[PDB]
């Protein structure tokens, strides 16, 4: 007998105030009982469970299931009730590495640690909560009652406690073997290195020698999977990675459920297939909850899908990470608020790709969206590689300088260079800081009757030019924008405009280049056509000349 170290137990508690489960066991057929006695008798001989007396007041229902070809019954303890009452744990397995962040390894071995799992003891003070009952034949004897001594499969804490217990056992081995990498996934332990196959096979045996200190046997994974590893939806090849096959189905009838499955595939593929777009296919889902509802594809959604079929026609792959090379991120504008990007170290050899979609908003402009995309890529790159990439952006250095020196918010984008890849991001208009000498001055105003929705918009100028237009089904804010629109339409290439609308000022001072409001868009089109525009604000109803004159014009 070689002494083995005990795996340190994790203390477990129930949620405050809650007691253990007390769920009634279901009646079972004679055949299922016979199976469960047979199964539990074996688990008992292996130490997994133990018989208990009738003083324990807790119980969890047990079942007997089977497979079609598998000529055996399967035991099943339904721990749903106990899980509701068990404390929360640190779930230390939610996120998985991204392949583009891995460095290639010459050799990789897989170990099966399925049997190691059962060597993890369950906190003894908690075992009582796991009691279950095998009903007896004909209910003529007391049922056989057991409790677990090991982490039950299906119990809330088994995944976190198991992985934590392995990590702590492996830590000294990883720290003292920095030339290997160890990664655990389910019952699988993945060991890679750049050692010659000889030294690598030795580290593996040393790892086995180490695990034996806790009595943990670990053979190889049954039917050793050849490359690529089918893992978390990827194909991990020795020198390259890609996503698993992306196959878009052919259909003449697309439902609300079909479109959800297509965006999911497209989204998954966008991490390596560059230029994927999902707006027009997403728009067909704006607001609905019946998945079988059929939604016709717009000629814009068909185009988007066909553009994606073109991208998906041939497989692509990313390279693994080389810490000695620079990390570079390039962004392109696609239109309709959509952005794509590539991250790479050598030209034409992408580590990964991605996309970014504009946020929902009544107004916006391309520079703000580009800035947001940069922040998203920055954060992703820190996650994957632990560093910010150098950016190549389709915006002139002088355009960016003008933007951030004049924009009313603080803004920042990290080290970057211009890449002359149309369409380029640009500023479409810039308002003057001072009034323009010799330019006509338009005093604008608008007003609308709340009840009738009738309104007026117009202007008066220092040259005696004047206009008032009657409007139907409008609002104060709408007439205020319409008045600015009329002044732009009726003025020369240089114009001073005086408004009292804080709402209109707030919109234009945000420097949008597109809007959900068709009226704002028309104003933007006019601004783009001007040489100089000065926009001034005055308080309403204060007797300011020009403003007082036009106010009475549009107020009935």
Taking the C-alpha atoms of residue 509 and residue 476, their distance in angstroms, rounded to an integer, is: 19
With CB cut-offs between 5 and 8 Å by kind, which of ligand K5C, other proteins, Mg ion, none does residue 551 bind?
Answer: Mg ion
Q: Binding of Mg ion at residue 540 (CB under 5 A)?
A: yes
Q: Does 123 appear as a known binding residue?
A: no
Q: Was 258 annotated as part of a binding site? A: no
Long-range own/partner contacts, residues 195-203 (CB < 8 A, 24 or more apart): 195/106, 195/107, 196/106, 197/107, 200/106, 200/107, 200/109, 201/109, 203/177, 203/179
Pairing verdict, β 240-243 and 234-236: antiparallel
Smallest distance, Å, CB 108 to ligand K5C? 4
187 in a known ligand binding site: yes
- Does position 513 interact with Mg ion (CB under 5 A)? The reply is no
Return residues touching ligand K5C (CB under 6 A). 97, 102-105, 107-108, 181, 183, 185, 190, 192, 227, 229, 231, 236, 238, 320
The answer to whether 365 and 425 have CB atoms below 8 angstroms apart is no
Is 551 labelled a binding residue? Answer: yes
What residues numbered 107-136 form the site for Mg ion, per CB under 5 A? none
CB of 445 to Mg ion, least distance (A): 4
Element (H, E) at 174: helix 158-175
- Nearer to other proteins among residue 5 and residue 379 (C-beta): 379
State which of residues 380, 445, 513, 548 lies at the interface with Mg ion (CB under 5 A).
445
DSSP 129-140: GG-EEEPPGGG-
Total residues at the site for Mg ion (CB under 5 A)? 3
Report the chain's C-alpha Rg in angstroms. Answer: 34
Residue 551 interacts with Mg ion (CB under 5 A)? yes
How far apart are alpha carbons 319 and 239 in whole angstroms?
Answer: 7
CA angle 495, 498, 503 (to 5 degrees): 120
Question: Do the beta carbons of residue 221 and residue 111 sit within 8 Å?
Answer: yes
Nearer to ligand K5C, 97 or 296 (CB): 97
User: Is 69 within any annotated ligand binding site?
Assistant: no
500 is in an annotated binding site: yes
Q: Which stretch binds Mg ion (CB under 5 A): 5-13, 43-51, 363-371, 441-449?
A: 441-449
Say whether 66 sits in a helix, a strand or coil. strand
* Smallest distance, Mg ion to C-beta of residue 514, A: 28
As a whole number of angstroms, the distance between CA 386 and CA 97 comes to 12
Compare residues 108 and 431 and give the one whose CB is closer to ligand K5C. Answer: 108
Q: Check if the beta carbon of residue 255 is closer than 8 Å to that of residue 292.
A: yes
Question: Which of other proteins, ligand K5C, Mg ion, none binds 404 (CB below 5-8 Å, type-dependent)?
Answer: other proteins
Nearer to other proteins, 54 or 95 (CB): 95
Contact residues for Mg ion (CB under 5 A)? 445, 540, 551
Binding residues: 112, 187-188, 445, 480, 500, 551
């Amino acid at each position: 007998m070689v002494p083995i170290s005990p795996i340190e137990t994790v203390p477990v508690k129930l949620k405050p105030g809650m007691d253990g489960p007390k769920v009634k066991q279901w009646p079972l057929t004679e055949e299922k009982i016979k199976a469960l006695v047979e199964i539990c008798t074996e688990m008992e001989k292996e130490g997994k469970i133990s018989k208990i007396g009738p003083e324990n007041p807790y119980n969890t229902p047990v079942f007997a299931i089977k497979k079609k070809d598998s000529t055996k019954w399967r035991k099943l303890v339904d721990f749903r009730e106990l899980n509701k009452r068990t404390q929360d744990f640190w779930e230390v397995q939610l996120g998985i590495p991204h392949p583009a962040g891995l460095k290639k390894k010459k050799s990789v071995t897989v170990l099966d640690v399925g049997d190691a799992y059962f060597s993890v003891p369950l906190d003894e003070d908690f075992r009582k909560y796991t009691a279950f009952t095998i009903p007896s034949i004909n209910n003529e004897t007391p049922g056989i009652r057991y409790q677990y001594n090991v982490l039950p499969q299906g119990w809330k804490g088994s995944p976190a406690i198991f992985q934590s217990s392995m990590t702590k056992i492996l830590e000294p081995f990883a720290a003292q073997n920095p030339d290997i990498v160890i990664y655990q996934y389910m019952d699988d332990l993945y060991v890679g290195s750049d050692l010659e196959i000889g030294q690598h096979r030795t580290k593996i045996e040393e790892l086995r020698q180490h695990l034996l200190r806790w009595g943990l046997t670990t053979p190889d994974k049954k039917h050793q999977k050849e490359p690529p590893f089918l893992w978390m939806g990827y194909e991990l090849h020795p020198d390259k990675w890609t996503v698993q096959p992306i196959v878009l189905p052919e259909k003449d009838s697309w439902t609300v459920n079909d479109i959800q499955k297509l965006v999911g595939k497209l989204n998954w593929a966008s991490q390596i297939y560059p230029g994927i777009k999902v707006r027009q296919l997403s728009k067909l889902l704006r607001g609905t909850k019946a998945l079988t509802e059929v939604i016709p594809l717009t000629e814009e959604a068909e185009l988007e899908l066909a553009e994606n079929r073109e991208i998906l026609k041939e497989p692509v792959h990313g390279v693994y990470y080389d810490p000695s090379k620079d990390l570079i991120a390039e962004i392109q504008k696609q239109g309709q608020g959509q952005w794509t990007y590539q991250i790479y170290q050598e030209p034409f050899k992408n580590l990964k790709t991605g996309k970014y979609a504009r946020m929902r908003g009544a107004h916006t402009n391309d520079v703000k969206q580009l800035t947001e995309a940069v922040q998203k890529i920055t954060t992703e790159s820190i996650v994957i590689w632990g560093k910010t990439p150098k950016f190549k952006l389709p915006i002139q250095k002088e355009t960016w300088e003008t933007w951030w020196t004049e924009y009313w918010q603080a803004t920042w984008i990290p080290e970057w260079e211009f890449v002359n890849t149309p369409p380029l991001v640009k500023l479409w208009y810039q308002l003057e800081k001072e009034p323009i000498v010799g330019a006509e001055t338009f005093y604008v105003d608008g007003a609308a009757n709340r009840e009738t929705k009738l309104g007026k918009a117009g202007y008066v100028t220092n040259k005696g030019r004047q206009k008032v237009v009657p409007l139907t089904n409008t609002t104060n804010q709408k007439t205020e924008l319409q008045a600015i629109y009329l002044a732009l339409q009726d003025s020369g290439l240089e114009v001073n405009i005086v408004t009292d609308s804080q709402y209109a000022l707030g919109i234009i001072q945000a420097q949008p280049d597109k809007s959900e409001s068709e009226l704002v868009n028309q104003i933007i089109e006019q601004l783009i056509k001007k040489e100089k525009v000065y926009l001034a604000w005055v308080p309403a109803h204060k007797g300011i000349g020009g403003n007082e004159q036009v106010d009475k014009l549009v107020s009935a």
